[PDB]
From TrEMBL, chain B:
<feature type="disulfide bond">
    <location>
        <begin position="13"/>
        <end position="45"/>
    </location>
</feature>
<comment type="subunit">
    <text>The precursor of protein E3/E2 and E1 form a heterodimer shortly after synthesis.</text>
</comment>
<protein>
    <recommendedName>
        <fullName>Structural polyprotein</fullName>
    </recommendedName>
</protein>
<feature type="disulfide bond">
    <location>
        <begin position="14"/>
        <end position="47"/>
    </location>
</feature>
């Protein structure tokens, strides 16, 4: 559960949106897409796995883990998308094609969003494009993101979070920086306050040796929970991998229906055939000669033709 | 499809950083000074100027590669196997042979 | 970089991965922390 | 000079984004964003969020973010 900087947000400038699409995948044969973000879904602040709610890094001076119901997560491209499932750092949804994919917390006035200028196309499996799989048709081998969130596609790891200094943690009264930790926080401070200095303080503290905030940084020992390897946080001085998490929605072999355009009316003539063709959508007509030469031929036929 | 992985940057805000090697595929890290990076909380370094920053990049197989992968293979000296059905007189038999 | 065989290994689960991608990292030319970089379009997909 | 931020040189010789001058961040050793910009800090008729963006407080329970801070969604009031 962390913060992240994304190229585009609810407001057209780039912003440190709590939700940040870190990666996308599209190898599904159904138009579903796997999305990896900076927020976790199906877990409580405590890390219990209540599927009804999701958590993320609090977007304020005092950073903690806040919670909300997954019903407020909208995924969109050219239009809204049916969410097929969610788990941890990842979501699975079926979206129409578009040049971008957007994740948005639609919490009314807490509406924030992340968009990646990543294209998605209405790809299809088989040999005949379709707007939607028909029923009078052959079942063919295809692969789709298994909706069972317990299925694992693989794993990508995480590390203990690195420092995350807060300007709000320092005050410059008296012309020397005061560390002003939030209540009860075991804040950890470091500063080249005239010289390299570090320490931990659980309460308001007066520094010595420097007169501007420019040199002093202050954060807290929030290592208690790990953070994804993404760039928006600086790594801990030891970034050795902290275990792993299973990527949900395994790409699984399955079967998919595909159309069978009206049987081509063959016309026979001397050492040659005329295929009469009638297709509403691009149909991959392919032929080869069984001779020594294959004379490989392939053409995306469309409409009525021969 | 190679999945580019850019690990979280490392910063030694007031000193040097080694551009050491690693075994990762196309591991191409480089070091840059004057980074003075801001995080959401604000400034994120000890020094105003001598802040060296290490940027890292390498690649691994994307998760979907378990299905979307392809394997290149050299192939040679192909041997033809065959299934035979033999019928002779009142007797019929089926066979397979290289 | 940018052609079939962009990334290669003996097994998909293997850590023994070798690759060439023309990856180059640019200066963090923005106040917000970032790691700007570029590379050749996945040669495998370009091939596809 | 013109440089990577397209905008003003601070007196240490670093080039700085003038788009950063009003942001409340000293981005430089010297001169460093201290020079004036208009931030009226309007009457409480307007709420002001945390970045200081004046917005009519009547929208502090509208269900639409009035500022990028999102402070108008404050549970205490809404
Ligand atoms: Ca500034
Ligand atoms: Ca509002």
């Amino acid at each position: 559960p962390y913060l992240g900087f994304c190229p585009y947000c609810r407001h057209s400038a780039p912003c440190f949106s709590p939700i940040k699409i870190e990666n996308v995948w599209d190898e599904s044969d159904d138009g579903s897409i796997r999305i990896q973000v900076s927020a976790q879904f199906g877990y409580d602040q405590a890390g219990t796995a209540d599927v009804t709610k999701f958590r993320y890094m609090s977007y304020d001076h005092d950073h903690d883990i806040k919670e909300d119901s997954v019903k407020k997560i909208a995924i969109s491209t050219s239009g809204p998308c049916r969410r097929l499932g969610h788990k941890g750092y990842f979501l699975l949804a079926q979206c129409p094609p578009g040049d971008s994919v957007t994740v948005s917390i639609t919490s009314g006035a807490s509406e924030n969003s992340c968009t990646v200028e990543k294209k998605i196309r209405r790809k299809f499996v088989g040999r005949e494009e379709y707007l939607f799989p028909p029923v009078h048709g052959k079942l063919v081998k295809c692969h789709v993101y298994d909706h069972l969130k317990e299925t694992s596609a693989g794993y990508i790891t995480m590390h203990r979070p690195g420092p995350h200094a807060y300007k709000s943690y320092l005050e410059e009264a008296s012309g020397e920086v005061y560390i002003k930790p939030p209540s009860g926080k075991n804040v950890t401070y470091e500063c080249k306050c005239g010289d390299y200095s570090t320490g931990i303080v659980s309460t308001r503290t007066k520094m010595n040796g420097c007169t501007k905030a420019k040199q002093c940084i202050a954060y807290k020992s929030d290592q208690t929970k790990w953070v994804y390897n993404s760039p928006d946080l600086i790594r801990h001085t030891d970034h050795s991998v902290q275990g792993k998490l299973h990527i949900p929605f395994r790409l699984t072999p399955t079967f998919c229906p595909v159309p069978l355009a009206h049987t081509p009316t063959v016309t026979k003539w001397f050492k040659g055939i005329t295929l009469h063709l009638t297709a509403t959508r691009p149909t991959l007509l392919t032929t080869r000669k069984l001779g020594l030469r294959a004379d490989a031929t392939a053409e995306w036929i469309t409409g009525t033709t021969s | 499809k190679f999945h580019t992985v850019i690990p979280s940057p490392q910063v030694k805000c007031c000193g040097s950083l080694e551009c050491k090697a690693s075994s990762k595929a196309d591991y191409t890290c480089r070091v840059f000074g004057g980074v003075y990076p801001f995080m959401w909380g604000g400034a994120q370094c000890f020094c105003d100027s001598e802040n060296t920053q290490l940027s890292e990049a390498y690649v691994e197989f994307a998760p979907d590669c378990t299905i979307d992968h392809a394997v290149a293979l050299k192939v040679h000296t192909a041997a033809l196997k065959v299934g035979l059905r033999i019928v002779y007189g009142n007797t019929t038999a089926h066979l397979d042979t290289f | 970089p940018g052609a079939f065989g962009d990334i290669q290994a003996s097994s998909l689960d293997a850590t023994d991965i070798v690759a060439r991608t023309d990856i180059r990292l640019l200066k963090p030319s923005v106040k917000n922390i970032h790691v700007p970089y570029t590379q050749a379009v996945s040669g495998y997909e370009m091939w596809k | 000079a013109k440089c990577e931020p397209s905008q003003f040189q601070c007196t240490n010789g670093r080039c700085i984004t003038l788009l950063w001058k009003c942001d409340g961040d000293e981005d430089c050793v010297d001169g460093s964003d201290e020079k004036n910009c208009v931030k009226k800090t309007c009457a409480e008729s307007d709420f002001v969020c945390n970045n200081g963006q004046c917005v009519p407080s009547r929208w502090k329970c509208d269900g639409d973010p009035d500022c990028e801070d999102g402070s108008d969604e404050s549970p205490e009031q809404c």
